[model samples]
Target: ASTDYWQNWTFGGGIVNAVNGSGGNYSVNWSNTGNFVVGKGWTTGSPFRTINYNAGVWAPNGNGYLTLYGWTRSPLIEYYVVDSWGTYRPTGTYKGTVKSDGGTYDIYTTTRYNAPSIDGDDTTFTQYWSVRQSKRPTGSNATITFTNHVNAWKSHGMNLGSNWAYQVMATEGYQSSGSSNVTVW
Candidate 1:
């Protein structure tokens, strides 16, 4: 199945309900504004979290939404991922399992610099994510290497479509609707 764009279809319902299955999915608490508009450029600046962009001004890291009310629907990227960061300890390690898309991915945390959104910040957010080609299930394992000033809270996610700036619609694991994709194992 293909999607016109990507968004947090199931915005909020609590971890107990959102991931209503077994312990197999990672609930991402992205601090994005409730909405946002496609094709519009914006800036970000929040101390406690990472902002979407920072070319102009600074606002609540999660105070704005991606409002795409007047855009045409179309398929963008087939798949993508969103990565987060943690406090780097020169020679330390952060780890977690990417639990999504009906499977889990073993991910070992690392550090990096110059990310797309929070790269050019004041204090420095060294954490970020990369778009993956395939989905890795639970009990799986992967390693990452860090080599720079790190941020405190960096997370990652996989998305489908090119409207990276707009919104996304992902499969809610056990849902039956045209708005969501089938997440199978």
Candidate 2:
């Protein structure tokens, strides 16, 4: 049987329900937006938790903020190009700095478990451009863009090891509680 493209998930006190369409487009309705992830063929209890491609969000025309709710201390690589807000960490074992449209951020790499404790083993490389804040959209439904900072990452004293991995753009919630809607084209 084919897999479902949408799923509802709960983690801690967070909930995320997401739907996807062609060309990397998604609509997300969330509450207690703490920390949750639902992606293509990704289930809450799956063994594998990484993919091999990158997707971008092409927003609709309006006055809204492309926000980042939170992130998992899990093993995965997420690339985010938001509309606005925040700063990057400076001194970590694995750290680097890069500049994107959102702002200048400290890129870092590390390993964290996926979830449930049993399904572990994930390496993550992230461009932490902003903190727990929000920024207004540059335009109505503008496309959030992300640049490949891998080369820049290496220059600043970090690495992704030598493994074949995928690119993921997910909506993460920390101590955030609200509803966010996104359209990716």
Stretches of candidate 1 exceeding 4 Å from the true structure: 1-94, 114-123, 128-185
Q: What does candidate 1's lDDT look like per residue over 102-181, in tens digits?
A: 33333333333432221132322222223222322222332221111012123433212223232221222211111111
Clashes of each: 37, 16
lDDT of 2 by residue, 104-170 (tens): 5555443334433212434323433322123434324432233244456446643332432322334
Give me the overall lDDT of model 1.
Answer: 0.22
Please list the C-alpha lDDT of all candidates, in the order they appear: 0.22, 0.38
Q: What is candidate 1's CA lDDT for residue 168?
A: 28
**Winning candidate number (lDDT):** 2
